[PDB]
């Protein structure tokens, strides 16, 4: 559920 790209800051899984 990232805005730009995959990142731990978001909800990437």
From Swiss-Prot:
It is found in: Secreted; Target cell membrane. Transmembrane segments: none annotated. The modification Leucine amide is found at residue 13. GO terms for biological process: defense response to bacterium; defense response to fungus; hemolysis in another organism; innate immune response. GO terms for cellular component: extracellular region; membrane; other organism cell membrane. Keywords: Amidation, Amphibian defense peptide, Antibiotic, Antimicrobial, Cytolysis, Hemolysis, Immunity, Innate immunity, Lipid-binding, Membrane, Secreted, Target cell membrane, Target membrane. Expressed by the skin glands. GO terms for molecular function: lipid binding. Belongs to the frog skin active peptide (FSAP) family. Temporin subfamily. Amphipathic alpha-helical antimicrobial peptide with potent activity against both Gram-negative and Gram-positive bacteria, and against fungi. Mainly acts by causing perturbation of bilayer integrity of both neutral and negatively charged membranes, probably by forming pore-like openings. Also displays anti-leishmania activity by damaging parasite membrane. Shows hemolytic activity. Also shows cytotoxicity against cancer cell lines. Strongly binds to lipopolysaccharides (LPS) and its lipid A portion. Adopts monomeric helical conformations when bound to bacterial (anionic) and eukaryotic (zwitterionic) model membranes. May also oligomerize as homo-dimers or -trimers in Gram-negative bacteria mimetic membranes, and from homo-dimers to -pentamers in Gram-positive bacteria mimetic membranes. Adopts an antiparallel dimeric helical structure when complexed with LPS micelles. This dimeric helical structure may interact with the lipid A domain of LPS. This is Temporin-1Tl. It comes from Rana temporaria (European common frog).
């Amino acid at each position: 559920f990232l805005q730009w790209f995959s990142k731990f800051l978001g909800r990437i899984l």
